[PDB]
Amino acid sequence: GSTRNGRDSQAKRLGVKRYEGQVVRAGNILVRQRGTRFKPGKNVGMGRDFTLFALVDGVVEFQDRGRLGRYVHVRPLA
Amino acid sequence: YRLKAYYREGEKPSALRRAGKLPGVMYNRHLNRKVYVDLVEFDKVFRQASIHHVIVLELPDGQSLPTLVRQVNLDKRRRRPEHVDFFVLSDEPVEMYVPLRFVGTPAGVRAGGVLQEIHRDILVKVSPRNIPEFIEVDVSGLEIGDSLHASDLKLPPGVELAVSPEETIAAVVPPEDV
């Protein structure tokens, strides 16, 4: 007659942290993702927990186009 | 048959459908022209003039359009039509759903079922000249166990047959005993 189950985990708080059209530095996390919802393009590196970040600085761009997954492209400025 | 038409130029029409003037649109290959028809004329002819009959539509340009219905959107807690999609037929074997029916003793009338699966006789495409008004299906002896239709004896006179399937057709169900 008691409460069977009333606990819940603390949120790890994932999500897209840098959208496109944003000037970034070398090292900014583009997206905190649980699984690899985004695939690395140019100048994009993954880590341990599928987190991809920028290798250089510039204006970032998404969706080169599909059929393999969503793309992240850190494009440098010239 | 013999229904009037008008024009629409991107109006309000939720405010126009208060006096029994529901909107519409007709086409055969192009010219998606927005019209509105009258509700007691369209409803009164639409009492018996079903999908099989070619409802013709007088237009202020002087043309008589051989149309039919594509869908009647039910008002869904009011039981009314919002918008009816007309379909002009052209020189093309267009698609038709003909409400055929059943005549005869169903299953030996005392030991009879229901024969409720009408389902609008799934599809028959036709030229505009060989289009029918009524095709008859008999139910000569079809008692409870055997003798089902199975669309094998579904050869209509002429044009055309059912295209892909032969599976949806009426059958005999047992009654509700106490």
């Binding site: - | 869904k76 807690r77 039981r79």
Partner: protein
């Protein structure tokens, strides 16, 4: 009564009752239909009480059609119990219905007998349920 034999989870929520119909206005099975007009719930006791009131009314012919299925567990706490301490027990599965949805559809019953039978089963439900016949208002092209 009747109940779903398998579920993913036992208890679930209530929600709201808005929306028009989400399907279920065209009859497509029988020649008549008992269509609802007010949003409420349909218990399995309301299903049984309306289903018995057909087969006991008309006999030897006419198949009855039901197009309602209870998948929502009505959750009620026991009597003289304070608030909290989890949800209550499950007593009977209810069925959410929307206005303008056709619930009961008679088959093989005539006009003056189907109006009467749907009139008898109309009083077994807490909803204003009017009666519609077979019209040309199908979804065919």
């Amino acid at each position: 009564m009747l109940m779903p034999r398998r579920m993913k989870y036992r208890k679930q929520q209530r929600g709201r009752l808005k929306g028009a119909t989400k399907g279920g206005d065209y009859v497509a099975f029988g020649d008549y239909g008992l269509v609802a007009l007010e949003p409420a719930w349909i218990t399995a006791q309301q299903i049984e009480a309306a289903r018995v009131a057909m087969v006991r009314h008309f006999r030897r012919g006419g198949k009855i059609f039901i197009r309602i299925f209870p998948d929502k567990p009505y959750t009620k706490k026991p009597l003289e119990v304070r608030m909290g301490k989890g949800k209550g027990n499950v007593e009977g599965y209810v069925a959410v219905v929307k206005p303008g949805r056709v619930m009961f559809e008679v088959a093989g019953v005539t006009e003056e007998q189907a109006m009467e039978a749907l009139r008898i089963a109309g009083h077994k439900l807490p909803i204003k349920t009017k009666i519609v016949r077979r019209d040309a208002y199908d979804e065919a092209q």
